[PDB]
Design an enzyme around this catalytic site. Structure first.
Site, PDB file in Angstrom:
ATOM      1  N   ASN A 127      -9.563  -5.662  20.999  1.00 26.25           N
ATOM      2  CA  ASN A 127      -8.627  -6.763  20.836  1.00 26.25           C
ATOM      3  C   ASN A 127      -9.345  -8.017  20.373  1.00 26.25           C
ATOM      4  OD1 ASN A 127      -7.476  -4.866  22.881  1.00 26.25           O
ATOM      5  ND2 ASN A 127      -5.726  -6.261  22.724  1.00 26.25           N
TER       6      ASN A 127
ATOM      7  N   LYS B 137      -2.831   5.427  13.757  1.00 30.22           N
ATOM      8  CA  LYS B 137      -4.220   5.025  13.490  1.00 30.22           C
ATOM      9  C   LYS B 137      -5.171   6.211  13.609  1.00 30.22           C
ATOM     10  CE  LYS B 137      -4.359   0.520  12.425  1.00 30.22           C
ATOM     11  NZ  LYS B 137      -5.010  -0.001  11.201  1.00 30.22           N
TER      12      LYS B 137
ATOM     13  N   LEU C 233      -7.675  -3.101   5.841  1.00 29.61           N
ATOM     14  CA  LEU C 233      -7.122  -3.768   7.023  1.00 29.61           C
ATOM     15  C   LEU C 233      -5.617  -3.814   7.053  1.00 29.61           C
ATOM     16  CD1 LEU C 233     -10.183  -4.572   7.079  1.00 29.61           C
ATOM     17  CD2 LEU C 233      -9.484  -6.624   8.227  1.00 29.61           C
TER      18      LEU C 233
ATOM     19  N   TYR D  84       1.906   3.584  17.120  1.00 33.11           N
ATOM     20  CA  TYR D  84       0.819   2.819  16.490  1.00 33.11           C
ATOM     21  C   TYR D  84      -0.526   3.519  16.681  1.00 33.11           C
ATOM     22  CZ  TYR D  84      -2.618  -0.926  15.896  1.00 33.11           C
ATOM     23  OH  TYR D  84      -3.710  -1.714  15.561  1.00 33.11           O
TER      24      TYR D  84
ATOM     25  N   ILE E 221       0.894  -3.575  13.066  1.00 27.21           N
ATOM     26  CA  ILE E 221      -0.035  -3.718  14.171  1.00 27.21           C
ATOM     27  C   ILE E 221       0.621  -3.808  15.534  1.00 27.21           C
ATOM     28  CG2 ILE E 221      -1.693  -4.847  12.629  1.00 27.21           C
ATOM     29  CD1 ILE E 221      -1.024  -7.498  14.256  1.00 27.21           C
TER      30      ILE E 221
ATOM     31  N   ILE F 255       0.802  -1.224   0.000  1.00 26.32           N
ATOM     32  CA  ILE F 255       0.000   0.000   0.000  1.00 26.32           C
ATOM     33  C   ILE F 255       0.844   1.288   0.000  1.00 26.32           C
ATOM     34  CG2 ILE F 255      -1.954  -1.168   1.065  1.00 26.32           C
ATOM     35  CD1 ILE F 255      -1.279   0.262   3.682  1.00 26.32           C
TER      36      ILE F 255
HETATM   37  N1  LIG Z   1      -5.708  -8.084  16.099  1.00 24.05           N
HETATM   38  C1  LIG Z   1      -6.390  -7.180  16.796  1.00 24.05           C
HETATM   39  O1  LIG Z   1      -6.563  -7.369  18.014  1.00 24.05           O
HETATM   40  C2  LIG Z   1      -6.916  -5.948  16.174  1.00 24.05           C
HETATM   41  C3  LIG Z   1      -7.872  -5.185  16.891  1.00 24.05           C
HETATM   42  C4  LIG Z   1      -8.323  -3.991  16.303  1.00 24.05           C
HETATM   43  C5  LIG Z   1      -7.887  -3.599  15.063  1.00 24.05           C
HETATM   44  N2  LIG Z   1      -6.953  -4.344  14.425  1.00 24.05           N
HETATM   45  C6  LIG Z   1      -6.584  -3.914  13.081  1.00 24.05           C
HETATM   46  O2  LIG Z   1      -7.076  -4.929  12.172  1.00 24.05           O
HETATM   47  C7  LIG Z   1      -6.212  -5.020  10.999  1.00 24.05           C
HETATM   48  C8  LIG Z   1      -5.762  -6.458  10.816  1.00 24.05           C
HETATM   49  O3  LIG Z   1      -5.059  -6.867  11.989  1.00 24.05           O
HETATM   50  P1  LIG Z   1      -4.656  -8.410  12.183  1.00 24.05           P
HETATM   51  O4  LIG Z   1      -4.633  -8.678  13.646  1.00 24.05           O
HETATM   52  O5  LIG Z   1      -5.428  -9.246  11.245  1.00 24.05           O
HETATM   53  O6  LIG Z   1      -3.133  -8.367  11.709  1.00 24.05           O
HETATM   54  P2  LIG Z   1      -2.350  -9.006  10.459  1.00 24.05           P
HETATM   55  O7  LIG Z   1      -0.940  -8.557  10.489  1.00 24.05           O
HETATM   56  O8  LIG Z   1      -2.658 -10.459  10.413  1.00 24.05           O
HETATM   57  O9  LIG Z   1      -3.142  -8.345   9.207  1.00 24.05           O
HETATM   58  C9  LIG Z   1      -2.611  -7.229   8.488  1.00 24.05           C
HETATM   59  C10 LIG Z   1      -2.262  -7.729   7.092  1.00 24.05           C
HETATM   60  O10 LIG Z   1      -1.786  -6.572   6.375  1.00 24.05           O
HETATM   61  C11 LIG Z   1      -0.620  -6.949   5.577  1.00 24.05           C
HETATM   62  N3  LIG Z   1       0.153  -5.730   5.442  1.00 24.05           N
HETATM   63  C12 LIG Z   1       0.843  -5.050   6.381  1.00 24.05           C
HETATM   64  N4  LIG Z   1       1.430  -3.941   5.916  1.00 24.05           N
HETATM   65  C13 LIG Z   1       1.089  -3.908   4.596  1.00 24.05           C
HETATM   66  C14 LIG Z   1       1.443  -3.057   3.489  1.00 24.05           C
HETATM   67  N5  LIG Z   1       2.220  -1.967   3.643  1.00 24.05           N
HETATM   68  N6  LIG Z   1       0.897  -3.355   2.296  1.00 24.05           N
HETATM   69  C15 LIG Z   1       0.147  -4.454   2.104  1.00 24.05           C
HETATM   70  N7  LIG Z   1      -0.220  -5.334   3.049  1.00 24.05           N
HETATM   71  C16 LIG Z   1       0.272  -5.065   4.283  1.00 24.05           C
HETATM   72  C17 LIG Z   1       0.017  -8.007   6.446  1.00 24.05           C
HETATM   73  O11 LIG Z   1       0.924  -8.837   5.726  1.00 24.05           O
HETATM   74  C18 LIG Z   1      -1.149  -8.791   7.003  1.00 24.05           C
HETATM   75  O12 LIG Z   1      -1.558  -9.922   6.245  1.00 24.05           O
HETATM   76  C19 LIG Z   1      -5.088  -4.033  11.255  1.00 24.05           C
HETATM   77  O13 LIG Z   1      -5.398  -2.778  10.603  1.00 24.05           O
HETATM   78  C20 LIG Z   1      -5.108  -3.793  12.746  1.00 24.05           C
HETATM   79  O14 LIG Z   1      -4.572  -2.519  13.096  1.00 24.05           O
HETATM   80  C21 LIG Z   1      -6.492  -5.531  14.935  1.00 24.05           C
HETATM   81  O1  LIG Z   2       2.877 -12.770  26.431  1.00 22.41           O
HETATM   82  C1  LIG Z   2       2.145 -11.800  26.737  1.00 22.41           C
HETATM   83  C2  LIG Z   2       1.569 -11.004  25.746  1.00 22.41           C
HETATM   84  C3  LIG Z   2       0.775  -9.958  26.139  1.00 22.41           C
HETATM   85  N1  LIG Z   2       0.542  -9.660  27.437  1.00 22.41           N
HETATM   86  C4  LIG Z   2      -0.344  -8.580  27.824  1.00 22.41           C
HETATM   87  O2  LIG Z   2      -1.631  -8.820  27.242  1.00 22.41           O
HETATM   88  C5  LIG Z   2      -2.285  -7.597  26.826  1.00 22.41           C
HETATM   89  C6  LIG Z   2      -2.649  -7.731  25.350  1.00 22.41           C
HETATM   90  O3  LIG Z   2      -1.419  -7.713  24.638  1.00 22.41           O
HETATM   91  P1  LIG Z   2      -1.393  -7.914  23.050  1.00 22.41           P
HETATM   92  O4  LIG Z   2       0.020  -7.836  22.645  1.00 22.41           O
HETATM   93  O5  LIG Z   2      -2.263  -9.081  22.683  1.00 22.41           O
HETATM   94  O6  LIG Z   2      -2.164  -6.659  22.410  1.00 22.41           O
HETATM   95  P2  LIG Z   2      -2.218  -5.062  22.744  1.00 22.41           P
HETATM   96  O7  LIG Z   2      -3.304  -4.787  23.626  1.00 22.41           O
HETATM   97  O8  LIG Z   2      -0.947  -4.638  23.441  1.00 22.41           O
HETATM   98  O9  LIG Z   2      -2.660  -4.647  21.362  1.00 22.41           O
HETATM   99  C7  LIG Z   2      -1.279  -6.489  27.147  1.00 22.41           C
HETATM  100  O10 LIG Z   2      -1.660  -5.862  28.400  1.00 22.41           O
HETATM  101  C8  LIG Z   2       0.045  -7.220  27.290  1.00 22.41           C
HETATM  102  O11 LIG Z   2       0.948  -6.609  28.197  1.00 22.41           O
HETATM  103  C9  LIG Z   2       1.134 -10.490  28.422  1.00 22.41           C
HETATM  104  O12 LIG Z   2       0.930 -10.175  29.627  1.00 22.41           O
HETATM  105  N2  LIG Z   2       1.904 -11.472  28.014  1.00 22.41           N
HETATM  106 CL   LIG Z   3      -4.868  -3.254  17.569  1.00 26.33          CL
END
Ligand SMILES: NC(=O)c1ccc[n+]([C@@H]2O[C@H](COP(=O)([O-])OP(=O)(O)OC[C@H]3O[C@@H](n4cnc5c(N)ncnc54)[C@H](O)[C@@H]3O)[C@@H](O)[C@H]2O)c1
Ligand SMILES: O=c1ccn([C@@H]2O[C@H](COP(=O)(O)OP(=O)(O)O)[C@@H](O)[C@H]2O)c(=O)[nH]1
Ligand SMILES: [Cl-]
Ligand SMILES: NC(=O)c1ccc[n+]([C@@H]2O[C@H](COP(=O)([O-])OP(=O)(O)OC[C@H]3O[C@@H](n4cnc5c(N)ncnc54)[C@H](O)[C@@H]3O)[C@@H](O)[C@H]2O)c1
Ligand SMILES: O=c1ccn([C@@H]2O[C@H](COP(=O)(O)OP(=O)(O)O)[C@@H](O)[C@H]2O)c(=O)[nH]1
Ligand SMILES: [Cl-]
Ligand SMILES: [Cl-]
Ligand SMILES: [Cl-]
Ligand code: NA
Ligand code: NA
Lengths: 313, 313
Positions: free
Chosen positions: A176, A151, A79, A147, A83, A58
């Site tokens: 999360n 966002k 997405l 981060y 992250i 991107i």
């Molecule tokens: N996992 C969570 O707890 C959580 C919660 C809220 C929001 N989000 C958001 O949801 C989205 C997806 O998160 P996820 O947990 O699936 O992580 P993820 O890393 O599995 O998904 C992100 C994807 O984007 C691709 N990517 C990264 N940078 C890129 C670039 N420059 N160009 C093209 N592709 C790229 C990665 O290879 C990956 O497959 C993210 O925007 C993240 O900020 C995640």
């Molecule tokens: O091995 C681990 C990984 C995470 N955390 C804690 O679990 C919460 C969630 O962490 P994660 O990295 O899943 O996501 P974040 O909230 O930081 O996006 C945070 O308070 C971390 O400090 C933890 O105690 N042990």
């Molecule tokens: Cl997140």
């Protein structure tokens, strides 16, 4: 519809893709595979509605322009992102470039071609919850890591296009998320890490005092919310949270997952300055606008997730 | 102290520079002269404490790195920006690159060299006032143009560095500022444009119905606020507004400035979708933290400004 899912080979992305394919949309994925592999989308390799999986970035302005110029997308679920909070502290630039600049590149083409954007933001852009009602979309923001700042920056560019141009957008702030297809190593989420440690017969390690809380959303519920925001014109112009409205401390999460199969230890917090002490979601707006609510309890989600992780060992 | 003023050849910037030189600091200006000329700083051409005026671009990463690597700044007042709402609607990218990316470039070097940043944001990042108490720092944000979005984006990167790294920063949100050295043409502010039209014996033209309001801050008061934020460690980590706590409609501003020397007309609003209907500042926080309040009334500021503009004709 013709739909672009950036980050569609990732954890949440692959579940978004699954749902969109079930709903018989034509889907294009754009993913640089920086944090994933195509194993996340093998399931879909023979679905004729999965049109292309472009391994591209991107941040590559020319690629992004060509992609929109040579397709006719209706809708983009954005997405793709860096992250990891700690990486953003260690290296803010890369997180900024991926999460703010990359968003902007896509947004510019969304305007050119009238493509609705669902922008995937994060519940991290919040200051802590202060009561049991939880955090609503009106509550304070606090960019405690680069981060989170990147966002929020992206959110505001996206919303500026809605106001200035009447471009349909939705800014979503899921809390999360955990489940099958989330990585289990150092780049994984706490639920994945803990379940995998249990299966590996190694201890769970908790950062800091473990009293910090999370509202943990099962990935299939998250993906349905994400998709719904894209399908809903009523959501256009809105910020919308998703979560369960219940939180758990990391101490208690560790006890739930271990079930005393393995020990549980505390270690120095890697970024206490960037931590959020209490994360608890008020998702009333999602319920009202999208008719969305989560279906999977933490207990049941942990079981599902452990089944999946065990299946790969 | 050794101080970098980005945008220091501009309207507000030149007044910041004047104050810093009065206070006997060593000042470096970084300004690409995209929206100004060196006539704004001629007054200071023989002050030995004005060390350099670098004609260079905050988007030039190598220049910004070299500038910080080869000086020992204590403090940076970051005023350089694209400032025009309509231009940001016509061309969002340029405004984004100047106002968000340019900020980020500076912020990265501020971290490397422990340089406090005062980030010049804008009262435009607000949704409208809804009562006579006015808009505080806790009140809602609404990025109604890409200018406003780019500024909010920059704020959040800046604040992320305060949280993640304990880098001293201040985010300041002054309200619409007017006075000597503000341009009077199509890129100028409404007060400058109206006074100049009066002096030129041409009508005042009001966008839309003219009922929209502004809280108008005289530039010498604004510059003192800006400087104070830099000098105050108590301000570190804060968002702080500045303004007068009184607003005026554009209709009434036009009558004040014209004094019936010239006619006053309405014309189609150039961006009603991005307008803010009521801008009125609550500056209690600035009063408390900085001991700041404005000294110049609108009536007296208009007179001062007209004297200056007339002096150039
Ligand atoms: N996992 C969570 O707890 C959580 C919660 C809220 C929001 N989000 C958001 O949801 C989205 C997806 O998160 P996820 O947990 O699936 O992580 P993820 O890393 O599995 O998904 C992100 C994807 O984007 C691709 N990517 C990264 N940078 C890129 C670039 N420059 N160009 C093209 N592709 C790229 C990665 O290879 C990956 O497959 C993210 O925007 C993240 O900020 C995640
Ligand atoms: O091995 C681990 C990984 C995470 N955390 C804690 O679990 C919460 C969630 O962490 P994660 O990295 O899943 O996501 P974040 O909230 O930081 O996006 C945070 O308070 C971390 O400090 C933890 O105690 N042990
Ligand atoms: Cl997140
Ligand atoms: N004028 C107002 O009403 C007002 C109110 C609130 C905040 N602000 C903010 O105050 C700051 C100064 O505004 P102003 O009214 O003095 O405008 P201005 O245009 O006179 O000042 C900005 C200066 O920055 C320089 N500049 C622009 N882009 C640059 C780049 N990429 N690299 C280097 N220099 C660059 C310009 O040449 C100019 O001298 C801006 O950040 C603006 O957003 C202005
Ligand atoms: O010739 C003009 C210039 C401006 N305005 C109005 O005056 C206010 C202030 O405009 P300016 O461009 O000074 O700054 P902005 O608030 O848009 O930053 C806005 O409501 C404009 O629509 C006007 O009516 N006529
Ligand atoms: Cl606990
Ligand atoms: Cl402004
Ligand atoms: Cl009026
Ligand atoms: Na709880
Ligand atoms: Na008023």
């Amino acid at each position: 519809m013709k739909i672009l899912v950036t980050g569609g080979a990732g954890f949440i992305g692959r579940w978004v893709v699954k749902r969109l394919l079930q709903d018989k949309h034509e889907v294009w994925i754009l993913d640089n595979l920086a944090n994933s592999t195509t194993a996340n989308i093998t399931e879909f390799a023979h679905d004729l509605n999965l049109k292309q999986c472009i391994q591209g970035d991107i941040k590559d302005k020319k690629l992004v322009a060509q992609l929109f110029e040579n397709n006719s997308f209706d809708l983009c679920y954005h997405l793709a992102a860096s992250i990891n909070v700690q990486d953003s502290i260690d290296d803010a630039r890369a997180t900024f470039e991926n999460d703010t600049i990359g968003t902007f590149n896509l947004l510019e083409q969304c305007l050119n071609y009238d493509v609705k954007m669902v922008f995937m933001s994060t519940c991290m852009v919040y200051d802590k919850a202060t009561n049991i009602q939880g955090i609503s979309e009106l509550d304070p923001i606090k960019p405690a890591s680069p981060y989170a700042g990147s966002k929020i920056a992206a959110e505001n560019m996206v919303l500026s296009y809605y106001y200035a141009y009447k471009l349909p957008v939705v800014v979503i702030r899921p809390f999360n998320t955990y489940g099958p297809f989330q990585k289990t190593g150092g780049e994984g989420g706490v639920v994945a890490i803990f379940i995998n440690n249990k299966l590996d017969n190694v201890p769970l390690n908790i950062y800091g005092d473990g009293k910090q809380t999370r509202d943990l959303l099962y990935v299939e519920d998250c993906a349905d919310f994400v998709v719904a925001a894209g399908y809903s014109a009523k959501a256009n112009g809105h910020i919308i949270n998703a979560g369960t409205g219940q939180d758990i401390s990391i101490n208690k999460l560790a006890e739930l997952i271990s079930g005393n199969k393995v020990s549980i230890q505390h270690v120095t917090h890697i970024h206490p300055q960037s931590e959020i002490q209490k994360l608890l979601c008020n998702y009333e707006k999602a319920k009202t606008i999208l008719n969305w609510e989560p279906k999977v309890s933490l207990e049941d989600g942990v079981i599902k997730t452990e089944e999946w992780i065990k299946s790969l060992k």
